[PDB]
Amino acid sequence: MFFINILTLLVPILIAMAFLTLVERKILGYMQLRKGPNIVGPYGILQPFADAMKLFMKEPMRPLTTSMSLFIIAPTLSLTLALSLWVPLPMPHPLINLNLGILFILATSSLSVYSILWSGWASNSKYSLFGALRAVAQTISYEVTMAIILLSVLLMNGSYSLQTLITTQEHMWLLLPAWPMAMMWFISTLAETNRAPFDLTEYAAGPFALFFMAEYTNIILMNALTTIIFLGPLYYINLPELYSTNFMMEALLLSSTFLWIRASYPRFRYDQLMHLLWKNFLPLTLALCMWHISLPIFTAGVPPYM
Amino acid sequence: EVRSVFPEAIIIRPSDIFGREDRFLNHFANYRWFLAVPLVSLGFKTVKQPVYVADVSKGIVNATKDPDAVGKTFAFTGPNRYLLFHLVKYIFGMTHRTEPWTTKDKVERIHISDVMPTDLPGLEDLGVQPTPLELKSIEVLRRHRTYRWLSTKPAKTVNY
Amino acid sequence: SKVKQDMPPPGGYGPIDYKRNLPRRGLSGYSMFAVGIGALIFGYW
Amino acid sequence: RSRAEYVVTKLDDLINWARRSSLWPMTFGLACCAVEMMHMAAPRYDMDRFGVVFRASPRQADVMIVAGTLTNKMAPALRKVYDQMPEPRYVVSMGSCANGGGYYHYSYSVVRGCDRIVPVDIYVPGCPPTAEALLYGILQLQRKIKREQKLKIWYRR
Amino acid sequence: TYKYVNKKEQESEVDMKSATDNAARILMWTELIRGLGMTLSYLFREPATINYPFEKGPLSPRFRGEHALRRYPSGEERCIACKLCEAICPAQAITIEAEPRADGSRRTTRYDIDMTKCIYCGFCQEACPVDAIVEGPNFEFSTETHEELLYNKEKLLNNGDKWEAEIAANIQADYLYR
Amino acid sequence: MNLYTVIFINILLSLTLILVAFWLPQLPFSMKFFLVAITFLLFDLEIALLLPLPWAIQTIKTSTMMIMAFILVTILSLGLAYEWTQKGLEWTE
Numbered sequence: 001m002f003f004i005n006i007l008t009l010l011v012p013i014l015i016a017m018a019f020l021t022l023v024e025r026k027i028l029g030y031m032q033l034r035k036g037p038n039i040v041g042p043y044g045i046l047q048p049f050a051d052a053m054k055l056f057m058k059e060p061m062r063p064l065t066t067s068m069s070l071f072i073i074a075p076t077l078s079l080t081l082a083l084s085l086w087v088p089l090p091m092p093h094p095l096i097n098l099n100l101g102i103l104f105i106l107a108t109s110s111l112s113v114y115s116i117l118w119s120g121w122a123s124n125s126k127y128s129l130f131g132a133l134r135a136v137a138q139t140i141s142y143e144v145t146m147a148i149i150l151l152s153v154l155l156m157n158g159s160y161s162l163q164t165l166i167t168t169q170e171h172m173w174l175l176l177p178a179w180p181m182a183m184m185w186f187i188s189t190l191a192e193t194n195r196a197p198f199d200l201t202e203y204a205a206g207p208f209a210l211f212f213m214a215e216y217t218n219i220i221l222m223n224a225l226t227t228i229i230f231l232g233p234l235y236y237i238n239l240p241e242l243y244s245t246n247f248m249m250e251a252l253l254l255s256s257t258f259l260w261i262r263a264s265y266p267r268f269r270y271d272q273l274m275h276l277l278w279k280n281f282l283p284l285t286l287a288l289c290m291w292h293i294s295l296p297i298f299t300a301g302v303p304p305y306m
Numbered sequence: 307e308v309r310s311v312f313p314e315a316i317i318i319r320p321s322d323i324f325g326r327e328d329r330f331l332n333h334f335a336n337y338r339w340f341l342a343v344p345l346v347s348l349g350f351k352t353v354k355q356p357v358y359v360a361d362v363s364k365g366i367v368n369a370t371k372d373p374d375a376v377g378k379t380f381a382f383t384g385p386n387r388y389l390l391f392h393l394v395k396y397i398f399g400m401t402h403r404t405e406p407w408t409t410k411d412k413v414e415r416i417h418i419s420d421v422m423p424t425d426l427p428g429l430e431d432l433g434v435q436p437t438p439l440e441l442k443s444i445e446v447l448r449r450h451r452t453y454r455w456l457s458t459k460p461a462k463t464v465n466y
Numbered sequence: 467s468k469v470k471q472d473m474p475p476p477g478g479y480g481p482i483d484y485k486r487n488l489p490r491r492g493l494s495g496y497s498m499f500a501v502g503i504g505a506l507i508f509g510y511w
Numbered sequence: 512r513s514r515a516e517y518v519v520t521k522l523d524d525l526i527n528w529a530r531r532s533s534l535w536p537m538t539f540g541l542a543c544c545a546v547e548m549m550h551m552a553a554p555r556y557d558m559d560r561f562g563v564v565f566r567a568s569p570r571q572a573d574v575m576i577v578a579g580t581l582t583n584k585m586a587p588a589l590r591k592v593y594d595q596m597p598e599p600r601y602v603v604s605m606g607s608c609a610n611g612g613g614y615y616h617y618s619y620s621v622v623r624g625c626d627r628i629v630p631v632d633i634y635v636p637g638c639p640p641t642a643e644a645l646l647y648g649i650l651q652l653q654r655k656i657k658r659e660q661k662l663k664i665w666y667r668r
Numbered sequence: 669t670y671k672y673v674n675k676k677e678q679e680s681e682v683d684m685k686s687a688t689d690n691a692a693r694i695l696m697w698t699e700l701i702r703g704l705g706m707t708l709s710y711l712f713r714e715p716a717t718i719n720y721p722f723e724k725g726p727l728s729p730r731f732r733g734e735h736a737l738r739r740y741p742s743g744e745e746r747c748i749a750c751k752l753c754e755a756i757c758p759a760q761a762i763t764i765e766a767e768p769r770a771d772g773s774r775r776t777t778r779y780d781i782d783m784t785k786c787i788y789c790g791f792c793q794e795a796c797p798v799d800a801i802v803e804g805p806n807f808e809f810s811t812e813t814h815e816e817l818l819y820n821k822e823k824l825l826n827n828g829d830k831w832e833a834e835i836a837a838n839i840q841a842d843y844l845y846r
Numbered sequence: 847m848n849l850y851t852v853i854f855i856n857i858l859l860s861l862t863l864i865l866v867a868f869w870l871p872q873l874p875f876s877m878k879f880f881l882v883a884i885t886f887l888l889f890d891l892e893i894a895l896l897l898p899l900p901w902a903i904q905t906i907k908t909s910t911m912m913i914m915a916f917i918l919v920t921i922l923s924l925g926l927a928y929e930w931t932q933k934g935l936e937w938t939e
């Protein structure tokens with residue numbers, strides 16, 4: 001039964017990823033006064049499948065100077081980290097209940113920036129290596145600001161569990177007490193997923209398809225994590241389907257918000273992005289971290305261990 | 307059969323042709339993907355003189371345009387005879403490293419020695435100077451090199 | 467005969483509002499700061 | 512015919528459908544014709560709706576749209592970019608310049624057609640041919656690669 | 669006259685309310701929210717996409733498309749081998765050879781127009797004194813080989829016979845302007 | 847056992863995806879990147895210090911814990927201020 005639960009978790013996530021590619025095409029088209037794909041399939045629902053089949057059907061131009069070991073390792077690592085990122089998520093019940101699931105999430109993102117660094121070093125080009133170093137510095141800085149923000153909001157929550165977060169959120173959203181933190185967390189998740197305006201942008205066919213799959217899977221996961229942490233869905237002990245549906249709706253709105261932002265904004269500069277983080281977020285992140293340290297002490301609202 | 311049905315047919319017999327898209331130099335480069343080099347009798351008994359594909363094509367075109375080539379058999383061979391082991395040593399040291407892939411007929415033709423072209427006319431008789439593998443080998447084996455080795459003594463030539 | 471040719475109407479074309487027109491819409495800075503602080507205190511309580 | 516050839520034909524249908532439904536170009540764009548290319552990318556004609564993705568890298572490209580005048584200084588760059596593109600690659604020449612030199616046919620620094628450098632699959636005539644006509648050329652390319660029977664040729668080998 | 673695009677009149681001072689407004693603007697992303705809103709408005713408009721090939725872009729009778737050689741209503745070729753089209757052809761895409769026909773008429777033996785050399789400028793159809801060569805409205809004639817765009821007299825006459833029901837109507841619609 | 851099974855399934859799925867992806871078709875150093883890398887090291891170890899705060903919030907001696915956390919985040923701020931003042935945060939020659 002556990003393997004059946006594994007299948008019914010992972011396969012719909014991949015379906016959501018492919019249709020996220022499709023809905024990004026359609027929303028960007030309709031925001032550009034045009035249409036998305038609709039010829040391929042009834043209403044474009046076969047377009048991501050055609051894209052994936054073409055990407056797996058085209059031969060991969062594999063250069064011999066590139067290390068086959070790293071060329072293999074980077075996309076398979078990125079996809080398996082996206083799926084391992086997805087597993088410990090309660091909706092409102094998880095496939096796997098971890099004691100420190102948020103620490104698991106952040107460290108899995110660290111292994112993802114290993115994946116992008118290894119892909120960049122395997123790509124034997126100096127411009128590719130330079131862009132790889134820029135992307136790793138981007139991902140690393142937004143990872144440190146995610147870790148501090150998430151630490152402070154779980155100082156409000158009580159533990160690194162996520163069912164504890166559900167019990168925290170069952171009366172109100174955490175957006176009201178931690179909304180500047182929510183804004184900075186949203187921007188941080190954007191720059192982790194390398195979406196516009198933080199995209200700042202090598203592989204053909206198979207590896208490119210794998211990287212595309214893992215990136216869009218990470219997009220859906222950052223949306224789901226933002227939903228579960230900051231915008232608590234309605235939870236009732238006698239029915240979990242209401243929680244699943246409401247979390248679904250908020251995750252779809254946050255994914256549409258990423259596509260909205262990519263349509264609306266021009267991309268940042270590399271110096272401007274580092275300047276933005278290290279001069280506006282991290283000072284505010286540290287100040288609000290100490291504020292959220294101080295808050296349960298002077299309000300006596302120290303959360304329970306369970 | 308070709309000489310029976312078309313008595314004045316120009317028959318051209320080249321040796322093992324090497325080139326950019328050949329199945330000779332790329333084949334010997336693709337032996338490295340296994341653990342070692344599988345040579346029968348360590349390749350000492352086989353003697354080969356490979357011929358460049360551009361040389362063979364120039365000979366073919368000059369045979370189309372040549373009035374004296376009618377009803378003749380030509381031998382298109384390289385200027386230098388190498389042993390199979392020395393050829394493998396040269397290709398591996400030039401690469402610097404250290405549709406079936408191969409068949410029984412393929413390895414039999416590999417281990418068959420090249421005959422001495424004595425009575426037959428050749429590329430010099432059709433007006434083509436046979437360029438050597440040392441001069442026309444870098445453009446073939448460069449695609450199998452590594453990055454450190456992207457940016458070698460010739461194998462010695464026997465008369466027999 | 468009478469010449470027929472692509473001409474403007476006798477009354478002339480209407481005015482064309484070529485100037486920049488930003489709507490100038492938006493809530494005030496003091497009151498959005500006030501509602502943000504109020505949301506913060508309500509959430510904290 | 513044999514039952515295996517029917518399965519091979521259906522597999523060809525599936526592969527050709529995938530390749531023509533997902534046609535990602537890079538436009539090696541030079542000139543007037545590249546401007547008309549981005550007018551085909553424009554919302555009226557919507558090659559993205561057709562399944563044809565605007566601004567793809569040559570590493571991810573399927574077809575090269577040669578749009579403009581190929582000069583002698585640019586032809587090695589064209590050949591290098593064509594060689595960097597992966598093996599299932601097609602070429603749509605567009606405009607009189609890329610077709611046969613066009614209005615600069617007798618020029619000292621203009622290659623008389625990009626077919627002297629790269630193998631052109633489909634020529635789109637005009638100066639510039641309309642975006643309507645370029646989208647015609649793209650759909651003709653989809654029909655052409657629908658007509659391919661690669662596993663049928665391999666089975667009949 | 670002239671006007672300033674970035675200069676501002678005098679000073680608006682430094683008031684606490686203005687400082688609070690600027691701080692709210694760059695702390696709560698007001699211009700970002702309004703840009704998101706009007707991009708959402710375009711999400712909620714109607715797309716300007718036509719349904720090719722079932723819908724076609726609008727054109728005019730002046731449109732310069734595929735070349736064609738017309739005829740008189742009797743069926744005689746309108747062309748009289750006068751070579752002004754190749755004289756005025758700025759790309760030198762027209763080659764004409766001519767001789768008297770068996771009845772002594774002045775007709776062409778060769779009329780080749782290179783589509784790959786043509787710039788589709790209409791100089792031939794505006795220099796033709798008898799309305800023989802025309803740029804008819806066909807534009808969907810992309811070929812898979814370079815040879816098929818090297819038109820000759822037979823191909824041009826076939827195009828003229830094919831598109832005569834539309835070329836003559838376009839010339840009827842527009843000939844009073846030219 | 848469950849997490850082992852899921853991670854093995856994940857790795858197997860990704861490996862079979864790359865296997866079908868292959869089988870189906872048949873220098874000038876810059877100092878500033880190192881600076882932000884080591885700044886990340888220092889801030890990440892300071893996160894490692896800051897991370898046990900969900901259990902440190904439950905202690906009896908809340909005043910001492912609060913003072914230590916305040917001092918630590920203050921020296922985070924002071925180090926970041928140092929690097930900002932000595933221009934380790936900009937990208938300029």
Ligand SMILES: CCCCCCCCCCCCCCCCCC(=O)OC[C@H](COP(=O)([O-])OCC[N+](C)(C)C)OC(=O)CCCCCCCCCCCCCCCCC
Binds near residue numbers: 697
């Ligand atoms: C979680 C749910 C979803 C939330 C987000 C919803 C979607 C919103 C999408 C908006 C568009 C985002 C696209 C990317 C934009 C990138 C640019 C950007 O945002 O730059 C950030 C900009 C950068 O500003 P900048 O670019 O002008 O630079 C500032 C520096 N100068 C001016 C010198 C150049 O703003 C910030 O960094 C501020 C972040 C928010 C801080 C909010 C603080 C509020 C008050 C704090 C609490 C105070 C009271 C404490 C308690 C008191 C109790 C009594």
Ligand SMILES: CCCCCCCCCCCCCCCCCC(=O)OC[C@H](COP(=O)(O)OCCN)OC(=O)CCCCCCCCCCCCCCCCC
Binds near residue numbers: 080
């Ligand atoms: C291509 C090469 C790729 C190389 C890198 C692969 C990365 C894979 C994706 C990331 C996986 C991250 C796993 C991190 C470790 C687990 C984290 C964790 O929280 O573990 C503790 C947890 C139980 O702890 P707790 O929550 O306290 O529960 C007790 C209360 N009931 O759970 C446990 O105690 C379970 C202990 C095992 C958990 C990890 C299982 C790993 C499985 C092996 C992977 C490698 C297999 C060999 C190679 C295959 C081919 C490459």
Ligand code: SF4
Binds near residue numbers: 579580607613614640
């Ligand atoms: S064919 Fe005509 S429109 Fe196209 S690039 Fe050449 S001159 Fe410009």
Ligand code: SF4
Binds near residue numbers: 762785789
């Ligand atoms: S339209 Fe073409 S054939 Fe006619 S004059 Fe112009 S370039 Fe020459």
Ligand code: SF4
Binds near residue numbers: 796797800
């Ligand atoms: S201008 Fe007209 S009539 Fe004269 S040669 Fe040309 S097509 Fe014939």
